[PDB]
């Protein structure tokens, strides 16, 4: 339903854009996007006048100086000179005018251009830079939003509502760096956990990826994945951070696509503490604690898989809503439902595959269609809800998927790039060569250390 | 007094070696170092027989097979062939014999060699690999050890003893990953903190490094470095981790040199919660909470300085006690007492310099001797205790010190090398090329990401 | 016929091995391979005695010291300890004994082992290190060897024999660094060249790779590829060196597979000055000057293709005869007959494809089988002679072929590796980490230069 | 006298600039630098009008469109916004106008600005990109220029003039890629060569760098550096190319500073075939064949020294005349006269040091001043002519000099950067990130090859 989530997010965004028009029409000056800085407003205007004699842009620049505005950058470059037949007439302005004088001279600039817009298109969808703001803003932007899910199967029990309230309070009031508040579990949830644990463990020897099996074995040895005791979150978070360098974060409510992908970028995984309804233990209408504990968490213990997911998250940064949907679809057809070709046979590592017993049976059956993984194909192919998936993609080696994702991100246009810093666990934008040099200096230092090591050995 | 600490550690180690002889002399088989594995014992013997005709090593290897021992690696190579005049006769054995049969055939091997030893010298001083064991073992190895310091100035007040008990309980019972337990502060300690804060802040505008000043300003803005409220440890730890990727760890008792250097390697700094005695606010007999908060913590906020310290810690890994002393001396003459040449004039960034008002006055005065920093010279030059330092080293740029330390580590012999992983914050030994290739793969992946970024920009 | 050449070379080598046995049998000491150094002989012996009690290797090492031999390295390590079920009993010796005393004590060592051999297997097939020896030794090893080719079509004309004599004299007496001696061309050869040039150029607009077309256009513009004048070798060599960093070398006679691959490694291509027989202008029984000028030379102007060929040559270094055959087959199915998928359609870049008009027609026809390129598949699939090829491999991008060859070389076992130095155009073996560090230093210097450039730009 | 050469070159250049004014003054449109392309002229104009109300730049841009000109890039950005107090008012234009209409509308643009210039300053001093043009253009630019040197000591003999004619004909008519035309030597020159060879070899055991000594030994072993036979140029060129990857080029006449530095960049060294005058064998008024054969050639055989010289040459590319003088001075105080600190004592490797017996005696004497090498200090300190040098710089390790030169080039501003390609021995400008990525791809490929090698070893 995450593709549904991405579609809902993008349609909500476009509706907001569809509602971003002034209530009162009739003003041709309503499309001039501007922002105000230090009492004045900095903005931009583009003109596309045809032919060559009508070059009255002087009047427009006679407008700009009419109020002693602060010009950041004026430029003019008639089109069809660098490329012919694809661009159109344009000339770039960026200027700061007194907010009162801004409209006054924009009235005069209306005497120069009528049928064009500002040259600056979509600037960027905002994204965090460090883990701290990732928690702080995305809890503030996700405040006061309870989940109803009444029409969903079950969820009519008041005790379920109280448990949801408790989980929401724990997650929403949780800050970064803090330890996971331990949550109790009565007999019903632990019994359901025991049932699902037994049913899934008895079949995990089959159809499952060997990495998943070994990760599960190590976790049940250390973290305590047993039918009797449902594991908490702090212990598994510590284990993952220690070995795979990964950690979790409790969350509830309607998570967007963007925040989830940002979390994925920061090598942190959002999670929910409560589990599915006891009336429906075989499947859950919404992914729950057991879903991640058995579908996401185990295969997430792989260093290469974690790196691949992190690369996905990195590519997700600052991407437009369409690209967000594409990345969500790729996640669905790779992480939630992913197939591997190892030891000759095909095994399953998908989270959704590793979270539903019926889907576990169906995935390796011959009824559903299976094909080799393709980034673009997985990014276009649609999904289904409340029904078994019939189309699957297989990746024999996670390295192959990683490099394919590298290529996909490379061909994905962005006005910048993104680098991750595990030292401070931060994100440094890549829009000027100076940051590239800064990163390369550390790269060279690591290379020198490696050379010293190589000299030492032998 | 850390050079004194390193000297005490090495003399204790050699005394243990001086006490590692059997109580009963007269057995020429007491020097055969051996360890027992799986019911049998794996060990090694070397022989240096002169001339060339006495080559009765066959008898020794007639000894080895006399009990069907498990031979790991037998080798023989007469000396003076590769290098002449510096080595001596040797031949390497490594074998596993039944622990009962081991001594029985060693009796026969005594018929072959008498005046030689085992070929395996010092294997390695054990060191941790991840942060978890760094806490767990080094708290278990440092258990049940209270500090007396009665002869030290003050410390006769029972309330001071109770405060020391509280700090020791907090630190010794603190585990990795846990948040810092907040510790209260009565009027006396906060008043002393206010006094020292005022006295040091009023002079930090002078004689101090600009990095220290800006770090202090940022901390007092965010962490709350003010005379009224003494800052805690969790907040500053969070700040350092967020910006400089550094964290602290409470500790008490007699810290060795080795564990401190290992902590330094893991980008974690050991610290004490209590402060100096109110009777002696001008100086402390032992470094305290204010010492690190004002001497270590501020300058530690520098990315380059933190990296330099981390490189020091990395070089410290597995080093023999003599090298431990050398590294301690370098730390004393660089971190505790370090001078920088910036903006034309000379400023101070040393922790001890930035922790004593009298030493702050004395350091930039013309009475003490000042010279340019040299790694070897700082590693040989001695110290003094309870008195102002007269010899100082200056480093105009922390990068220069960093590369000099790189060179010093390069010329420092080790049977391996060390690499740091900030993703999982772990340590991977460097003794086989395969680990080098593993690291280089990630290096190449980062290079590919940088190339993609460079393609994107422009 | 190059696969035939590789097969002939390997069967000749094994026949020499089959003839490397002493004429007089009956001596169990005839299999002890040894070499003599400075009046003594350095060699090695292996023993595989079963069980554990028969450990009379002492007697063998009682043999070694019986003549005061010079022992380089004695080792002993019973098998089934590191790996069980695949190895067998062994222990390594390497020793130098007086050449007269060598056989005398080998007689005694025969009292210890009878059914085993020396531990050192195939050391290496010798290969050059620089361009100079590549010319000097491989002309000395290929001296006094005329080509007969009488049974081949044509070649009964005495004038053809005289032309072959002239070409052989020019090539065989040509030294490295010298300019190409210009060779005249009478009316017959230039007329045949005009005919083949017209026929191939009229069709090169079709079925041919765009890189080939542009390279041919540039060459005919500069080098002078025209039907009227047959181009010489010095001009095209200068052009290739200037642009693609490649050069040619005249050669005749029966070229082995090894020397050709070594030349390929050194970014130099062996060539013949004479052309095919006028009686058979449509096809040649043996590749000639026009074959390379139109099949090899043009596509060789590609930087990426030249790099790919150079990587092939690099992988060829020191490879055993079987691997030589594999590399030859890969060259045949990639260089001589290679298909590319560009601009949607499939084009041909194979040298043999680009050298035969009939094969040019046949290659893009639907009768022959066409498949995607696979390194292993192309290395196993056989060939045919004097008949059109029915099986072809296609590579959409030369980079894909390059990385596949990288992988193939990686999985190809060698006791060392090879690096190329275009500064001195030499080859440095890679068998010790020190050379790796030496190379990495230059790599880091280039990285620093790139960082300086990046800082400068912008 | 090379500093004199650089000074003469720069004063000639500025005199040409001082003579680049129109013969007829009085036209305020004579300073508008313009170039004509495809029948029209592309150029640029800058205006610095004070205050803010006089913003009549519209009129100037009303001028530009008055003839339907082709505008490449118009920009406007008032100063004091990004940086205050150091820049002045400016706005950038670059436009192409009909060459007849260009002056016509420039007349109107004179009504807008009078006291300013074009915004494009010095574009670049032209430099070659490959070895071929380096020879072709710099022989065409240096055509018909005989050397007089009559006032110089000796050189009154007609036979000397004839020898100079022969050398000039050989060098000036020599093309790249061609072998060195061998030049005969009568009894007088070979006798002088024998004398200087004996005198310099008898002292080269002293005061000389060990690298020079070993290089000389290897050359006299192979190339044939003996008093009886004066060595030619082709043999030594082959030797240097084979080992150090360096080659020579005959040249005569008044060589500029720029062409010499470009040659140095291309790892090629200009040289003269004739030698000094027999009347003055102890010293030469101008450097000759023996000077380079004994001063430049031997120490040039060092890989590190050759790399350092190549880095100097690389930095020299496109540098302005002042920077050319700086580089020349650095060459004089490093290559011509350089001191090294090895084995404890100080030795000499300077070319001029290694070319004059009297200067050889004087250099290691205590009369001249000796100091540690500094790039800036050597780039500012002046010289003397026909007299012994009194000031010398010493570099203990050529790597130190190399990295200091790296830093000096880094701080040297250029609108681009330079990279060398030994594969095709070419120069690729570094002004766009795409070329950086192209280079980095090959760097990564070499890294992958190194990783494969490292995997193979062990
Ligand atoms: N993004 C939609 C919610 C979600 C998150 C993580 C999962 O593993 C999953 O199956 C579903
Ligand atoms: N190592 C001795 C104790 C110590 C630790 C850190 C310091 O900064 C300091 O001044 C003293
Ligand atoms: N190696 C066999 C001879 C040969 C060499 C080069 C070729 O391009 C070719 O077609 C044939
Ligand atoms: N550049 C001035 C001429 C010159 C060139 C090379 C030298 O080594 C030298 O001493 C003098
Ligand atoms: Fe899931
Ligand atoms: Fe301190
Ligand atoms: Fe061919
Ligand atoms: Fe010189």
Author numbering:
A (entry chain B), B (entry chain C), C (entry chain D), D (entry chain A): 40 to 497
Manuscript text:
Tyrosine hydroxylase (TH) catalyzes the rate-limiting step in the biosynthesis of dopamine (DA) and other catecholamines, and its dysfunction leads to DA deficiency and parkinsonisms. Mammalian AAAHs mainly present as homotetramers with a three-domain subunit structure: an N-terminal regulatory domain (RD) that consists of a structured ACT (aspartate kinase-chorismate mutase-TyrA) domain preceded by a less structured N-terminal tail of varying length; a central catalytic domain (CD) that contains the active site iron and binding-sites for substrate and cofactor; and a C-terminal oligomerization domain (OD) responsible for dimerization and/or tetramerization. Inhibition by catecholamines and reactivation by S40 phosphorylation are key regulatory mechanisms of TH activity and conformational stability. We used Cryo-EM to determine the structures of full-length human TH without and with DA, and the structure of S40 phosphorylated TH, complemented with biophysical and biochemical characterizations and molecular dynamics simulations.
